[PDB]
């Protein structure tokens, strides 16, 4: 297995988005690409990462391969990579290690790190299915700001989604707060727009803590997509370039 990515930042950005929510995850590598999937320790939320092989500038995978990785360790290793470095993962032969190679874009500096892998014999899953009642597309930074803000008011947010727009509510000791977003007349910009694809209006309460963990994926995308139906977990989805996606699933 060898996978090289000219835009190393992305990888850095992904690990940052994951390491705090899930400390230990198993990477499923095939010629289709990388699929990471894990629940947090409380089993309330579910992170599903996909990075298809075509997005990499070179990709080799002889045999379908499963690597037990500590993501805090991998993040600590990736901080040692410059924001513009060419990052190459290599795991040729199960050597019980994962090699990372950070190349300075001007080739006078090269680093290589070796990471001890973990034994994780119980395996995956991978069901991103469904049609949803509401699908909201919005600025990622705005959503982040909102979760952070309402964390002040309460620990739970009520998302009330209808045709006109979406409402984020919180109630606490000090009082209550409602943040209304109206569907913007026309879509534009690197996305300041709010789009609502609705079959039926929904209203669901989620824990703000977990959302505040999801919003760490903000650097990855300008937009975030919230998919909701009643009695199904919310899907907070960030598109990763053209090579994949990061989806968080949060049970209401």
């Amino acid at each position: 297995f060898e996978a090289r990515l000219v835009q190393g930042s992305i990888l850095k950005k992904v690990l940052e988005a994951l390491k705090d929510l899930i400390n230990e995850a198993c990477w499923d590598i095939s010629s289709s690409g990388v699929n990471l999937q894990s629940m947090d320790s409380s089993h309330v939320s579910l992170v599903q990462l996909t990075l298809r092989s075509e997005g990499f500038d070179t990709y080799r995978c002889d045999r379908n391969l499963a690597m037990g990785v500590n993501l805090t360790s991998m993040s600590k290793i990736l901080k040692c990579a410059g924001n513009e470095d060419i990052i190459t993962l290599r795991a040729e032969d199960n050597a019980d290690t994962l090699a990372l190679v950070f190349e300075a874009p001007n080739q006078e500096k090269v680093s290589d790190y070796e990471m001890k892998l973990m034994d994780l014999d119980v395996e995956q899953l991978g069901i991103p299915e469904q049609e949803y009642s509401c699908v909201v597309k919005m600025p990622s930074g705005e959503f982040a700001r909102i979760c952070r803000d309402l964390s002040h008011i309460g620990d739970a947010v009520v998302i009330s989604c209808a045709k006109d727009g979406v409402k984020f509510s919180a109630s606490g000791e000090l009082g209550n707060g409602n943040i209304k977003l109206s569907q913007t007349s026309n879509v534009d910009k690197e996305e300041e727009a709010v789009t609502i694809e609705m079959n039926e209006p929904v209203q669901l309460t989620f824990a703000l803590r977990y959302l505040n963990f999801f919003t760490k994926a903000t650097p990855l995308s300008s937009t975030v997509t919230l998919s909701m139906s009643a009695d199904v977990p919310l899907v907070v989805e960030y598109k990763i370039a053209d090579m994949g996606h990061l989806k968080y699933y949060l049970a209401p």
């Binding site: 309330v44 069901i127 199904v232 949060l250």
Partner: peptide, 5 residues
Amino acid sequence: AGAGA
């Protein structure tokens, strides 16, 4: 309150 989906 597990995800599961």
